[PDB]
Amino acid sequence: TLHALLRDIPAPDAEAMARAQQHIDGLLKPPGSLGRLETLAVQLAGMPGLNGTPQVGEKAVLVMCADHGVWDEGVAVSPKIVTAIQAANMTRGTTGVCVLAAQAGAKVHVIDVGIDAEPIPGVVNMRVARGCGNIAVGPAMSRLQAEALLLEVSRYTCDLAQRGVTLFGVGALGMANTTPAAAMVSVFTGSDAKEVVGIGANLPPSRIDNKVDVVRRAIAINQPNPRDGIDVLSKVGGFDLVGMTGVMLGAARCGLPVLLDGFLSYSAALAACQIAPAVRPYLIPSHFSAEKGARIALAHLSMEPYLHMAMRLGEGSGAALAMPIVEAACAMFHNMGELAASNIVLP
Amino acid sequence: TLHALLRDIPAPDAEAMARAQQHIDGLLKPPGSLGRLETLAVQLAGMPGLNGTPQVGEKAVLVMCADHGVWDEGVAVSPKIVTAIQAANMTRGTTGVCVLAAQAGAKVHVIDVGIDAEPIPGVVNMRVARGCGNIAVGPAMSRLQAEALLLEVSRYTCDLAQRGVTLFGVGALGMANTTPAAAMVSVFTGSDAKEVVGIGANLPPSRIDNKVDVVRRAIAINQPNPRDGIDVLSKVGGFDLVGMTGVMLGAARCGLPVLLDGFLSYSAALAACQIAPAVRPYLIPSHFSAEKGARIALAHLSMEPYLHMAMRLGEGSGAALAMPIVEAACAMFHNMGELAASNIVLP
Numbered sequence A, B: 001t002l003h004a005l006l007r008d009i010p011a012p013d014a015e016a017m018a019r020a021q022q023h024i025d026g027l028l029k030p031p032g033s034l035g036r037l038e039t040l041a042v043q044l045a046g047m048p049g050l051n052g053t054p055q056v057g058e059k060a061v062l063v064m065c066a067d068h069g070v071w072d073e074g075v076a077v078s079p080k081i082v083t084a085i086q087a088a089n090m091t092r093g094t095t096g097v098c099v100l101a102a103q104a105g106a107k108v109h110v111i112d113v114g115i116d117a118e119p120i121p122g123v124v125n126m127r128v129a130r131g132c133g134n135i136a137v138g139p140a141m142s143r144l145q146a147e148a149l150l151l152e153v154s155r156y157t158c159d160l161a162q163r164g165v166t167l168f169g170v171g172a173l174g175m176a177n178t179t180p181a182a183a184m185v186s187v188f189t190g191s192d193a194k195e196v197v198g199i200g201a202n203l204p205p206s207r208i209d210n211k212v213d214v215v216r217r218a219i220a221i222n223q224p225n226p227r228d229g230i231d232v233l234s235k236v237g238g239f240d241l242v243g244m245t246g247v248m249l250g251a252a253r254c255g256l257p258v259l260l261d262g263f264l265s266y267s268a269a270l271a272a273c274q275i276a277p278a279v280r281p282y283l284i285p286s287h288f289s290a291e292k293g294a295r296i297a298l299a300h301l302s303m304e305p306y307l308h309m310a311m312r313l314g315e316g317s318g319a320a321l322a323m324p325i326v327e328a329a330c331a332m333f334h335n336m337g338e339l340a341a342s343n344i345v346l347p
């Protein structure tokens, strides 16, 4: 049950983190000198699914795919069918996340949570409906639907630990999805839509006003409660966004790290941390998205991404891009020598 | 001769870069959406040693090691012998750059350009002297010495292309070296020493004034000419700094990319670009160093690093950390599918 899942997310292990800090300070470098590589290694050490040390085994990027009724409001220049086309391209390894996941030695799990097309053979089927409701006139979905999807994706996510996965990445694929993401960021952070509505996939500068109006209208009509993240997801989110929140809840329940991607994923992370604050210590940023609302979302998560790539793709490519940085933190921790063994004494 | 080397650095290939841009725009994503991954792939395509396409073969991080007379001015809390000790640790794979270079699949070349100790078996010997002169009272070395070292390191660097290397990284190891680096950054950028003198390897906050005075005194007594980068290097730099400038000149002569590390490397890059502007298109930043003067140095190079890791080690570990990002740009370029083949038409 969702209540059980939320209640049983483990706290980070303070003892393992103290041991980790002490080992890091003792390595062959001035104390502190590897900066956020050091803080990352300690954060990893505290995640109970890593068994008391920073480590990476198998890596999985979960790509959540769905279509959105709000496409019909003129907020996206990408033809709606691109969601289905690109989801099928993920089976052939030709997409950005597939290619970057391969470079990083990660496997990609393509999960259809509500594409508006026939099912795609070889893609995991968790379809809620053929596209979610148009958030401009009503909700994306029912609360029951959002809850059922969270549970099922979090179970699928934590089940991957049984096949050796220790490091997740999350992403979303769905034309128009930077619209519900902007709506969710506005509701959770209390910023007006104008501060957090971006160009998504090359929206002409001249259609931004419309997209701002659409977000406002979505929040006005749905009245999502900012203190109930499942409410917000079901009313002004989408199936893909709910799907990414689900991955975060599952990694967290599993005591394992999850790398965010960009703006889409920040919205799902905001919902996830609202639903269960205990999720936060498991989240690791990758890059600082080009989308207008990225700063605000990241500030509300007190998060500072490692990578500044002006990226705005999603699908998980940014998460995959940051996997080698997590592995570098573990290599630092395990493979460096020690000051004492070289007889180096520093003040 | 150095004049020949400088004169014959090739210009970037505009034709290869146009072809690269066109191929990138055609791939399976909104145009522009992979941001600085795209601009990196185009920059790589223009480097004539890469044969008209972004690619990575073998990778080498060149670690330039030397001691500095200015240690005697009280500007470094690390015992001077650490340079020699850590240089020997590089032979055993226990240092940060060795460990991060291994993660990235790069080989480390340890080059002793003037350590104040007996030679270390198994380290490349290009020693100019046992430590350079104390820049507070006189020059680090003669012009002839700086020139000879530039030539020899640039030759060793470009010779690595014959063994398949296509991607270099640079770093330096030498106690007190953030002092001449700060002096060089001050001279090239025209910022007063106080704006660009950092804590280096954990200098107590209370000893910063002394280190500012030392830099000022070095520039006062030596009167390095900011429009003659070899002058600046020989007077207020060090052998390690000259050694990194040499790697940049050699990669550039070879038409190949070089990844900077942190503050030390920014100072050498400033000298390199002053000596030969044609070096600039070959340089690729890695991370944004924690050292106080990093911003100013990077602004003078119009450079925006990819990684924000609050790192301050050097030795090349930051360069090695960024190698997977260069490889990701190449994987994007070569392995993604195309819009046309999926019949996707965007405005």
Ligand SMILES: Cc1cc2nc[nH]c2cc1C
Pocket: A028, A029, A030, A344, A346, B078, B082, B086, B172, B173, B174, B201, B313, B314, B315
């Ligand atoms: C241990 C040690 C390692 C280093 N590597 C580069 N600078 C250094 C300074 C110290 C003190």
Ligand SMILES: Cc1cc2nc[nH]c2cc1C
Pocket: A078, A082, A086, A172, A173, A174, A201, A313, A314, A315, B028, B029, B030, B344, B346
């Ligand atoms: C081609 C294409 C690929 C994408 N991947 C994620 N969003 C996308 C939008 C488009 C248009």
